[PDB]
Design a protein around this motif. Structure first.
Motif, PDB file in Angstrom:
ATOM      1  N   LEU A 189     -11.702   5.083  -6.325  1.00  0.00           N
ATOM      2  CA  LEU A 189     -12.820   4.252  -5.901  1.00  0.00           C
ATOM      3  C   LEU A 189     -13.107   4.446  -4.424  1.00  0.00           C
ATOM      4  CD1 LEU A 189     -14.392   1.617  -7.382  1.00  0.00           C
ATOM      5  CD2 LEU A 189     -13.197   0.517  -5.478  1.00  0.00           C
ATOM      6  N   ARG A 190     -12.069   4.703  -3.627  1.00  0.00           N
ATOM      7  CA  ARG A 190     -12.329   4.838  -2.200  1.00  0.00           C
ATOM      8  C   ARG A 190     -13.027   6.129  -1.854  1.00  0.00           C
ATOM      9  NH1 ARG A 190      -6.761   2.121   0.328  1.00  0.00           N
ATOM     10  NH2 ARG A 190      -7.104   0.088  -0.676  1.00  0.00           N
ATOM     11  N   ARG A 191     -13.260   7.021  -2.819  1.00  0.00           N
ATOM     12  CA  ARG A 191     -13.922   8.298  -2.566  1.00  0.00           C
ATOM     13  C   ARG A 191     -15.233   8.447  -3.309  1.00  0.00           C
ATOM     14  NH1 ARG A 191      -9.688  11.708  -0.028  1.00  0.00           N
ATOM     15  NH2 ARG A 191      -7.650  10.805  -0.593  1.00  0.00           N
ATOM     16  N   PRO A 230       0.813  -1.230   0.000  1.00  0.00           N
ATOM     17  CA  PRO A 230       0.000   0.000   0.000  1.00  0.00           C
ATOM     18  C   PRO A 230       0.841   1.272   0.000  1.00  0.00           C
ATOM     19  CG  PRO A 230      -0.823  -1.575   1.627  1.00  0.00           C
ATOM     20  CD  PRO A 230       0.463  -2.131   1.113  1.00  0.00           C
ATOM     21  N   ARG A 244      -2.710   8.299  -5.789  1.00  0.00           N
ATOM     22  CA  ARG A 244      -3.017   8.634  -4.402  1.00  0.00           C
ATOM     23  C   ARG A 244      -2.936  10.145  -4.175  1.00  0.00           C
ATOM     24  NH1 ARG A 244       0.761   7.037  -1.136  1.00  0.00           N
ATOM     25  NH2 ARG A 244       2.092   5.787  -2.527  1.00  0.00           N
ATOM     26  N   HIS A 260      -7.035   3.225 -10.062  1.00  0.00           N
ATOM     27  CA  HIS A 260      -8.432   3.506  -9.766  1.00  0.00           C
ATOM     28  C   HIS A 260      -8.715   3.423  -8.280  1.00  0.00           C
ATOM     29  CE1 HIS A 260      -8.348  -0.796  -9.245  1.00  0.00           C
ATOM     30  NE2 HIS A 260      -9.484  -0.669  -8.584  1.00  0.00           N
ATOM     31  N   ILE A 261      -7.900   2.661  -7.548  1.00  0.00           N
ATOM     32  CA  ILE A 261      -8.231   2.351  -6.159  1.00  0.00           C
ATOM     33  C   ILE A 261      -8.313   3.610  -5.303  1.00  0.00           C
ATOM     34  CG2 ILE A 261      -7.196   1.380  -4.045  1.00  0.00           C
ATOM     35  CD1 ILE A 261      -8.638  -0.842  -5.564  1.00  0.00           C
ATOM     36  N   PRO A 262      -7.381   4.565  -5.385  1.00  0.00           N
ATOM     37  CA  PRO A 262      -7.554   5.784  -4.591  1.00  0.00           C
ATOM     38  C   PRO A 262      -8.794   6.580  -4.974  1.00  0.00           C
ATOM     39  CG  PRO A 262      -5.292   5.527  -5.387  1.00  0.00           C
ATOM     40  CD  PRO A 262      -6.109   4.574  -6.130  1.00  0.00           C
ATOM     41  N   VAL A 310     -10.200  -8.251  -5.471  1.00  0.00           N
ATOM     42  CA  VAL A 310      -9.905  -6.874  -5.846  1.00  0.00           C
ATOM     43  C   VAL A 310      -8.478  -6.797  -6.372  1.00  0.00           C
ATOM     44  CG1 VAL A 310     -10.176  -4.482  -5.155  1.00  0.00           C
ATOM     45  CG2 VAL A 310     -11.339  -6.263  -3.865  1.00  0.00           C
ATOM     46  N   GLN A 317      -5.376  -4.085  -7.109  1.00  0.00           N
ATOM     47  CA  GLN A 317      -4.943  -2.730  -6.785  1.00  0.00           C
ATOM     48  C   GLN A 317      -4.431  -2.027  -8.037  1.00  0.00           C
ATOM     49  OE1 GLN A 317      -5.034  -1.166  -3.389  1.00  0.00           O
ATOM     50  NE2 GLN A 317      -6.632  -2.760  -3.580  1.00  0.00           N
TER      51      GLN A 317
END
Ligand SMILES: COc1cc(N(CC2CCCC2)C(=O)NCCCn2cncc2C)ccc1OCCN1CCOCC1
Ligand SMILES: [Zn+2]
Length: 321
Positions: free
Chosen positions: A271-273, A169, A177, A267-269, A262, A264
């Motif tokens: 998607l978390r918003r 991470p 990020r 897109h992951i940062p 899932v 990583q």
């Protein structure tokens, strides 16, 4: 209320002659020579190729007639090797427009140690090139957005996707990020009435690892399902008119099946918003993934062109053009 327009947006589906216009108006030959080949170089963050990679992108974007507003977002972040610099590229049309469709790719390669260099042909190079082509191909149609829903197109070429040492991470997605948080903090539109640049994202269509022959893309997320089904319908209706090359309806790219785990990615940062993501990554991954056999010789020129065509219609349908 306009942050919620994305949830309700409907396409305007092109007719068969229009599909006949867009399939001739793009060509993998020009994409191969003018857009893809210069990025087949060592280009990890803060490298000599990284700058050359970035100036390749922006130059081609300014060749175009549509008035793209380029933005380089340089920033510092810690890595397992001390404090590094990363510069995401962001090309924008109608920066003043409240909603944007976002096609995304990362342009960095991963640092590796025989007599062969890691160029990440599929690991970004083709997808980033495919984003260049689509802009050259649809130029005449994007130029229509200069003169005035409140929706337009945005290209993002993230930096520093790759792990430097060992994927974690903390050692991953540096460029996205930061750019998510920066976007969650940037007031959009200039009015600045409680909305962010993240709120102005309609859909994040993240291309990755695309060039390999015979890819099958799973449908990762319920909230992008209908757009995945428009990708099926677009692939069907290109084949049925005989606009796809070496394409068979039994071995298709976009098959309905879901994905359970899932992956990583950049897109992951977002998607978390609460950004609706359309993650155009194949599963399984290309067999060349993260090996120096990942190169031009193991790319399928015909698969890439079919996907060029399919994607270019999606955004021409999404944008009501
Ligand atoms: C689906 O598939 C693979 C996925 C992954 N996960 C999932 C987690 C990894 C451990 C626990 C689950 C992943 O987060 N990955 C991030 C890499 C992202 N990234 C790097 N550059 C571009 C991108 C998008 C890991 C391995 C997978 O399989 C690889 C097997 N292949 C090897 C050679 O080719 C054929 C099979
Ligand atoms: Zn990679």
């Amino acid at each position: 209320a306009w942050p919620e327009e994305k949830n309700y947006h409907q396409p305007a589906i092109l007719n068969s002659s229009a599909l006949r216009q867009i399939a001739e108006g793009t060509s993998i030959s020009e994409m191969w020579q003018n857009d893809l080949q210069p990025l087949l170089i060592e280009r990890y963050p803060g490298s000599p190729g990284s700058y050359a990679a970035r100036q390749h992108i922006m130059q081609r974007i300014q060749r175009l007639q549509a008035d793209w507003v380029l933005e380089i977002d340089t920033f510092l972040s810690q890595t397992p090797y001390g404090y590094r610099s990363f510069s995401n590229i962001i090309s924008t049309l109608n920066p003043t427009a409240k909603r944007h469709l976002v096609l995304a790719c990362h342009y960095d390669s991963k640092y590796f140690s025989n007599n062969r260099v890691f160029v990440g042909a599929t690991d970004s190079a083709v997808p980033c090139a495919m984003m260049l082509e689509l802009a050259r191909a649809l130029d005449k149609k994007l130029l229509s957005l200069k003169t005035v829903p409140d929706l337009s197109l945005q290209l993002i070429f993230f930096d520093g996707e790759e792990a430097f040492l060992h994927w974690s991470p903390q050692d991953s997605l540096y460029g996205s990020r930061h750019l998510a948080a920066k976007m969650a903090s940037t007031p959009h539109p200039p009015g600045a009435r409680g909305t962010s640049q993240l709120h102005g994202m309609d859909l994040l269509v993240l291309l990755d690892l695309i060039g390999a022959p015979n890819p099958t893309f799973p449908n990762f997320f319920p909230n992008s399902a209908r757009w995945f089904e428009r990708l099926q319908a677009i692939e069907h209706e290109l084949h049925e008119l005989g606009l796809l090359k070496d394409h068979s309806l039994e071995g298709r790219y976009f098959q309905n099946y879901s994905y359970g785990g899932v992956i990583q990615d950049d897109h992951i940062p977002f998607l978390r918003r609460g950004v609706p993501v359309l993650h155009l990554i194949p599963s399984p991954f290309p067999e060349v993934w993260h090996t120096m056999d990942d190169n031009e010789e193991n790319l399928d020129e015909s698969t890439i062109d079919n996907l060029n065509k399919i994607l270019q219609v999606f955004v021409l349908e999404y944008l009501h053009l």
